[PDB]
C-alpha cells in the first residue's frame, strides 16, 4: 500500500493538482483517467520516485518491488533488445554484475571469497538461475524471436519494441506502474493478449491507458485526475 501524503506538483503559474492524498493498494487494480497535459504523466513519475513533488511524500513500502518501465521507445535506440531486457529485478541485476567480477577481476582477496560466497547465495535466493528462463519465456511469449534477440534497439518495429520492453516490467513484479499501453496502436489481438495475462496474473497495477474498451476489459478502480 503506497500512500500519497499531500502530494502537490506545480509547473509555472498554475499547479497541476493540489492536496493529493490517496492510499493506493489493496488487491484491486487501479487505472487513472485525465486530459493529457494534466498530471497523469507526472503523477506516476512522482509515485515511482523519479521526480519528487513540490510538497508531499511517496511513503513507499520497503520491499514490495515497485515495477517501472521506460515508456517511450523512440529515444533509447542504443541499448539492444537483450540489453534492455536484461537491465526489473534491480537487486538481481546488481548481484549478477557484482558476481561477474570473478571472470573479470584477475584475482581475489580473503574477504572477497566471503563476498562471492554470499553473492551467489543471494543470486540463488532471488533465483538468478531461472532468471534467464523466465526472461526468455516472456520475450518469446510477447512475440519476438531468438533471431531478433541480439539485434539493435532501432532496427525493429515499435509494434514489437513494446512487446520486448513489456518484459522488463513483468519480472514477477507486484505493484507495477504501466504507462500508456495503447499509443503506437497495437493490433487489438496483442491488446487482448495483454488484457488476458494481466487479468490472470495477480498484482497491483496502475495504468494510464487511453482506450475505453481496453480499460473496460482490464481494470477495476478508476482514478479521475480531472478537476484538481
Amino acid at each position: 500500500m503506497l500512500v500519497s501524503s499531500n502530494v502537490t506538483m506545480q509547473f509555472g503559474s498554475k499547479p497541476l493538482f493540489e492536496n493529493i492524498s490517496v492510499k493506493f493498494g489493496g488487491g484491486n487494480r487501479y487505472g487513472l483517467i485525465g486530459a493529457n497535459g494534466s498530471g497523469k504523466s507526472t503523477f506516476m513519475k512522482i509515485l515511482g520516485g523519479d521526480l519528487e513533488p513540490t510538497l508531499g511524500n511517496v511513503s513507499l513500502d520497503p520491499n514490495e518491488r515497485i515495477g517501472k518501465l521506460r515508456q517511450d521507445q523512440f529515444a533509447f535506440e542504443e541499448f539492444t533488445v537483450l540489453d534492455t531486457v536484461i537491465m526489473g529485478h534491480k537487486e538481481l541485476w546488481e548481484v549478477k554484475q557484482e558476481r561477474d567480477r570473478i571472470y573479470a577481476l584477475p584475482e581475489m582477496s580473503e574477504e572477497d571469497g566471503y563476498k562471492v560466497a554470499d553473492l551467489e547465495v543471494k543470486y540463488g535466493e532471488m533465483d538468478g538461475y531461472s532468471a534467464e528462463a523466465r526472461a526468455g519465456e516472456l520475450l518469446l511469449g510477447v512475440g519476438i524471436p531468438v533471431e531478433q534477440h541480439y539485434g539493435p534497439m532501432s532496427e525493429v518495429a515499435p509494434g514489437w519494441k513494446l512487446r520486448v520492453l513489456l518484459a522488463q516490467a513483468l519480472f514477477a513484479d507486484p505493484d507495477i506502474l504501466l504507462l500508456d499501453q495503447p499509443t503506437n496502436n497495437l493490433d487489438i489481438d496483442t491488446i487482448r493478449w495483454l488484457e488476458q495475462v494481466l487479468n490472470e496474473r495477480d498484482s497491483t497495477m496502475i495504468i494510464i491507458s487511453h482506450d475505453r474498451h481496453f480499460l473496460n476489459m482490464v481494470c477495476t478502480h478508476m482514478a479521475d485526475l480531472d478537476y484538481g
Binding site: 506545480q10 509547473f11 509555472g12 503559474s13 498554475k14 513540490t54 510538497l55
Partner: protein, 50 residues
Amino acid sequence: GIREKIKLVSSAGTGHFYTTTKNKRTKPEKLELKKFDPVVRQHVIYKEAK
C-alpha cells in the same frame, strides 16, 4: 494574500529555520540563500521547505 508564507530550513542538519514570503506563481524554485546558522554559528545554505 497572493504571496504565500514559506520557510527556509537549514542544511547544517540543525533545526533552525528562517521564514519569509514568496510569490507562489512565478516559477516554483527552492530558494537558495546563504544565511547565518546560530546553532553551529556559521554561514550555511538554507534550502526552502515547508
